[PDB]
Curated annotation (Swiss-Prot):
Main location: Golgi
Stretches that traverse the bilayer: 93-114, 137-156, 164-184, 204-224, 359-381, 412-433, 734-751, 763-782
Domain statement: Each HMA domain can bind a copper ion, they are tightly packed and closely interact with each other. Wild-type ATP7B can usually be loaded with an average 5.5 copper atoms per molecule.
UniProt-reported outcome of changing G30D: In WD; increased interaction with COMMD1; decreased localization to trans-Glogi network
Naturally occurring in which organism (per UniProt): Homo sapiens (Human)
Main function: Copper ion transmembrane transporter involved in the export of copper out of the cells. It is involved in copper homeostasis in the liver, where it ensures the efflux of copper from hepatocytes into the bile in response to copper overload.
Impact noted for substituting E584G: In WD; yeast complementation assays show that the variant fully rescue iron-uptake deficiency of yeast mutant ccc2
Cytoplasmic side: 157-163, 225-358, 434-733
Variant or mutagenesis effect after changing G677E: In WD; uncertain significance
Lineage, broadest ranks: Eukaryota, Metazoa, Chordata, Craniata, Vertebrata
Protein name: Copper-transporting ATPase 2
Recorded consequence of changing N681S: In WD; loss of copper transport activity; increased ATPase activity; does not affect localization to late endosomes
Effect after changing V709L: In WD; uncertain significance
Mutagenesis / variant outcome for changing T430M: In WD; yeast complementation assays show that the variant mildly rescue iron-uptake deficiency of yeast mutant ccc2
């Protein structure tokens, strides 16, 4: 609400543009954060609304020379499709191929010697002194290529040099310009002096530079388009037409209408036919069916839906036509929230990505400086100490003097050095891997948001687990009810009815189960009235019950733990003390009822622990990550559940108000701690923790406290999360190695340093080996897509044999 803005910018091609925009925006006063993503081609800037406005930012960006505008809401398929760029580059490569094949044929013609040549290759026969017939052909072809094929590069270089910064097309422009000008000058010198021999000139590389450049920029765009497959699949899945119906009295169809999404609103009734997707989230009215949403949440089995259930906009119906009342319309749908989260994920760049962006702005000037230095050093060493070079170039040619071979070698090695560096490979090394990892995660339920949690999960050594709703099923079950007081004046019917109607005021997850159990067991769905309902979280509920004749025809009630009754001045006996201990030791929490100070009895509550908790924590123990449990109930139940699952340390009897002090002391030791809670309930604890993991959040992915969201209520997904995140971060580092080893080896070789060995590359060879790096980086990023999601048997395989049982003795507890 601080005037945070998100913008779309068009025309960002190079990897040096990001550093320019980020630095220019940050340096301006009134702005503290501005991150721009090339792949998404968007920007996220936060600023003081009073000091500056959005139009000021737009004007600044346009002053830089880029077209910026406010972010659109639905239309983004073209942004991630890259269709226009692929089409343009393929067309340019096909157009430039017409001037490439003749040059390749001419070059290969001279190298291979015919066994019985017709005239022994008289295609180089001089026609007028100094100008060979071959050199005229190269001159014509090179002039046509320069004036017709390189226009786009010249335009980009001019539009870049109008400002201080320079894109990566400046390298190509300088390479071609030097290769043309030097050759033209040497040809003019040869013709003017009427020399007999035509010198070897640089008219063969410009016809060969552009072909390879266009091929590389077409293949790399085609490969990049494969990185955004998950985004395209998610975005082009929601429907655009809805069948609005009208119900007269008994849901009878008055009429039918076809409506777009921008006109349908909440509360409307929409019908879905078999084989059709649900257009809008809502509540099922009538009809039993089943639908599969493997393209949204990732499970394989088809969930069955009954009248009154929930639907997801994007799942495909199978059986019958179902009427649903719309609840979340348009952007409020789960799919829209998921895709918005995914797009926003590629905005919080990692520190390693920040370093890469910093190193991507001082690369083009560095390459130009290195090229000029190489040229100067070669010319000086040629003109000063001819002995060293002539040791490797011994033959004194009469056709060309030793003075004019040094200049040729220096220019060749000063062109190849700046025609081999690939700033793109260093630029897009990490973002493509990040996008592929986030997409492959989203296609499996895991919804890692932001780039920072990707590397944050790599170094996490402590995972923290909540009890209610995370390790347990979250649906309490009542074992049995024990009576300790009187039976005549306090029958089971009376106590059950009064406790049900007393808790009906509350909405705690444990109490709804016992209230509905009372309603179903007493045979009456009615209840009394509750007054003076005191409800202290972590302590209990105390109130008064009136109208006790509504159920008994077929009262200070205190519900809480021991300290609750002690607070209200109620004594506790020893028989009651050891009564429910037998059930408490079996992982079943028990509550004690006291009506008017009378120890009426005990009610046993049990919740089944999830099966995956038996393995999910164990793998985490075998992965080298510590685990801990937090719960607010009594110590014995926490010990029982920890023994049943296998967590050593536990923080029991924690009140639901602090919830951060334990996380604070855990983080005080220097480790990075991630807590796996439930969502809105444990927001402060997740916010304090470095990585917030919200498990069991169905259609509730709009959570800001947590930086990792899991939709499927599966603990193993947590194991699937970290085990994936590392495999992304590693894939980033490799991407930043191939972009450096190529750069730190392609420069010395193109610099002629390997002359004593005898390794010199023609400038065309320096660009045919440049597209390779750009394609290979994206290809290595794409390798993450080959990810088979592990199953229960997969985890059982490596976990078989070594799974140590534990007793209550080897279980720690909290500290005060």
């Amino acid at each position: 609400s601080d005037g945070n803005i998100e913008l779309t910018i068009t025309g960002m091609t190079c990897a040096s543009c990001v550093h320019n925009i980020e630095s220019k925006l940050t340096r301006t006063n009134g702005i503290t954060y501005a991150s721009v993503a090339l792949a998404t081609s968007k920007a996220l800037v936060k600023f003081d609304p009073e000091i500056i406005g959005p139009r000021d930012i737009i004007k600044i960006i346009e002053e830089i020379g880029f077209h910026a505008s406010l972010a659109q809401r639905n239309p983004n398929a073209h942004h991630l499709d890259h269709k226009m760029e692929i089409k343009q580059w393929k067309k340019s490569f096909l157009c430039s191929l017409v001037f490439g094949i003749p040059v390749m044929a001419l070059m290969i013609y001279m190298l291979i010697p015919s066994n019985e040549p017709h005239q022994s290759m008289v295609l180089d026969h001089n026609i007028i002194p100094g100008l060979s017939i071959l050199n005229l052909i190269f001159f014509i072809l090179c002039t046509f290529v320069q004036l017709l094929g390189g226009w786009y590069f010249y335009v980009q270089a001019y539009k870049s040099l109008r400002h201080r910064s320079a894109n990566m097309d400046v390298l190509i422009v300088l390479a071609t310009s030097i290769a043309y000008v030097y050759s033209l000058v040497i040809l003019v010198v040869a013709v003017a002096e009427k020399a007999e021999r035509s010198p070897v000139t640089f008219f063969d590389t410009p016809p060969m530079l552009f072909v390879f450049i266009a091929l590389g920029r077409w293949l790399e765009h085609l490969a990049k388009s494969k990185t955004s497959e998950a985004l395209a699949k998610l975005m082009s899945l929601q429907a655009t037409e809805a069948t609005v119906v009208t119900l007269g009295e008994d849901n009878l169809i008055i009429r039918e209408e076809q409506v777009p999404m921008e006109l349908v609103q909440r509360g409307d009734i929409v019908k879905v036919v078999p084989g059709g997707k649900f257009p809008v989230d809502g509540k099922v009215l009538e009809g039993n069916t089943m639908a599969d949403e493997s393209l949204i949440t990732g499970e394989a089995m088809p969930v069955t839906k009954k009248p009154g259930s929930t639907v997801i906009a994007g799942s495909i119906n199978a059986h019958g036509s179902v009427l649903i009342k719309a609840t979340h319309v348009g952007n409020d749908t789960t799919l829209a929230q998921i895709v918005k989260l995914v797009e926003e994920a590629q905005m919080s760049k990692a520190p390693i990505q920040q370093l890469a962006d910093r190193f991507s702005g001082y690369f083009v000037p560095f390459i130009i400086i290195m090229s000029t230095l190489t040229l100067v050093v070669w010319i000086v060493i040629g003109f000063i100490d001819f002995g060293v070079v002539q040791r490797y170039f011994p033959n004194p040619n009469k056709h060309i003097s030793q003075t004019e071979v040094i200049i040729r070698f220096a220019f060749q090695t000063s062109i190849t050095v700046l025609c081999i560096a690939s700033p793109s490979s260093l630029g897009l090394a990490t973002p493509t891997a990040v996008m592929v990892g986030t997409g492959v995660a989203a296609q499996n339920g895991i919804l890692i948001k932001g780039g920072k949690p990707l590397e944050m999960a790599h170094k996490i050594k402590t995972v923290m687990f909540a009890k209610t709703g995370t390790i347990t099923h979250g649906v309490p079950r009542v074992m049995r009810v024990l009576l300790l007081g009187d039976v005549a004046t306090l029958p089971l019917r009376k106590v059950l009815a009064v406790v049900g109607t007393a808790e009906a005021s509350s909405e705690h997850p444990l109490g709804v189960a016992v209230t509905k159990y009372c309603k179903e067991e007493l045979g009456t769905e009615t209840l009394g009235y509750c007054t003076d309902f005191q409800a202290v979280p972590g302590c209990g509920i105390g109130c008064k019950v009136s109208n006790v004749e509504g159920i008994l025809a077929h009262f200070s009630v205190l519900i809480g733990n021991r300290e609750w009754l002690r607070r209200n001045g109620l004594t506790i006996s020893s028989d009651v003390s050891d009564a429910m201990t037998d059930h408490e030791m079996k992982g079943q929490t028990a509550i004690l009822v006291a009506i008017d100070g009378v120890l009426c009895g005990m009610i046993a509550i049990a919740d089944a622990v999830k099966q995956e908790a038996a393995l999910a924590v164990h793998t985490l123990q075998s992965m080298g990550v510590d685990v801990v449990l937090i719960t607010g109930d009594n110590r014995k139940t926490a010990r029982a559940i920890a023994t049943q699952v296998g967590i050593n340390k536990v923080f029991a009897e924690v009140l639901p108000s602090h919830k951060v002090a334990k996380v604070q002391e855990l983080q005080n030791k220097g480790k990075k701690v991630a807590m796996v809670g439930d969502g809105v309930n444990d927001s402060p604890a997740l916010a304090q923790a470095d990585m917030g993991v919200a498990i069991g959040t169905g259609t509730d992915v709009a959570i800001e406290a947590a930086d990792v969201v899991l939709i499927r209520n599966d603990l193993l997904d947590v194991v699937a999360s970290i085990h994936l995140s590392k495999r992304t971060v590693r894939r980033i580092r490799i991407n930043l190695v191939l972009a450096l080893i190529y750069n730190l080896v392609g420069i010395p070789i193109a610099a002629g340093v390997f002359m004593p060995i005898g390794i010199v590359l023609q400038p065309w060879m320096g660009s045919a080996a440049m597209a390779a790096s750009s394609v290979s980086v994206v290809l290595s990023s794409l390798q993450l897509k080959c990810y088979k999601k592990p199953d229960l048997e997969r985890y059982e395989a490596q976990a078989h044999g070594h799974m140590k049982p534990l007793t209550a003795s080897q279980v720690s507890v909290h500290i005060g």
